[PDB]
Amino acid sequence: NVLYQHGTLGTLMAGLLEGTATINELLEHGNLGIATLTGSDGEVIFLDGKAYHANEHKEFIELKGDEKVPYASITNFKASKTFPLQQLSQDDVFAQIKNEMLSENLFSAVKIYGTFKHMHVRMMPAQQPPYTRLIDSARRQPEEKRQDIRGAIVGFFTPELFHGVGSAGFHIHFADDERAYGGHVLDFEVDDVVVEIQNFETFQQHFPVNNETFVKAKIDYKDVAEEIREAE
């Protein structure tokens, strides 16, 4: 039960958007997760060992594998608990997961598959170097909503003390069965779905020690906590 993370949310938010790991390299550590590409281009969804990408132009494709990522979270999903849910809001769905998870003091992974009455996502717009704080991208991000759509939500829960390294609470992405729509979930309403949870005993954090920008950078985390809450 290990959650693998390449880079961190706080450092990404700080403006270090250079791709430092390969999609293929990430897949070596898991089959379910979330991420983004160099320049924080779009939304990466790791689903069933495959890597998908939804960008700011409503495009949706399966990544070749050589694309680079500045921040990614992945795991070899092994559900330790499964249970259904119907006709519930995002808040109510999270409250259920909060009830079924082993502990909110631990990291955990979730998978929600089925039909969604409502789905609301954003596709982080890509930046070109020199980079700026990621909050600037989020403030001009496109958002797309759908209704009565079938797909899967995948993500992770980060415990309080780890806010910054990961995200404050749930961080989830969506990919529809048609593999034509998806992104970072901002809101949703389940119609009929199945929820799978996995509690982690180990958190493996990897750093891009070979990336000169990261190594030499003087990272400013001023207001990073507040920005993360506005951006995601």
Where on the chain is the footprint of its own copies (CB under 8 A)? 1, 8, 10-11, 102-103, 105-107, 160-162, 164-165, 199-207, 209, 214-217, 219, 221
Please say which residue, 61 or 215, places its beta carbon nearer to Zn ion: 61
DSSP state, residue 161:
G
What is the smallest separation between the CB atom of 48 and its own copies, expressed in angstroms?
Answer: 26
Of the ranges 100-108, 133-141, 178-186, 200-208, which one interacts with Zn ion (CB under 5 A)?
Answer: 178-186
Per CB under 5 A, the list member of 120, 122, 133, 184 interacting with Zn ion is 184
Q: Which does 125 bind (CB under 5 to 8 A by kind): its own copies, Zn ion, none?
A: none
- Judged by CB, which is closer to its own copies: 28, or 128? 28
Distances (CA, A) of 2 to 12, 54, 77, 86, 232: 22, 26, 9, 30, 24
Specify the residue for token string 């909060």.
98
Stretch that binds Zn ion, among 19-27, 97-105, 184-192, 222-230 (CB under 5 A): 184-192
Told to check if 122 binds Zn ion by CB under 5 A, we report no
Look at phi and psi of residue 169 and say left if phi exceeds 0, alpha if psi is from -120 to 50, else beta. Answer: left
Residue 120 is a binding residue for Zn ion (CB under 5 A) = no
- CA-wise closest residue to 172 among 188, 160, 192: 188
The rounded distance, in Å, linking the Cα atoms of 153 and 187 is 11
Residue 106 near residue 200 (C-beta atoms within 8 A)? yes
CB 62 → its own copies: shortest distance, Å? 28
Query: Tell me, what amino acid is at 125?
Result: P
Tell which residue, 60, 72, 81, has the closest CA to residue 32. 72
Residues interacting with Zn ion, by CB under 5 A?
Answer: 184
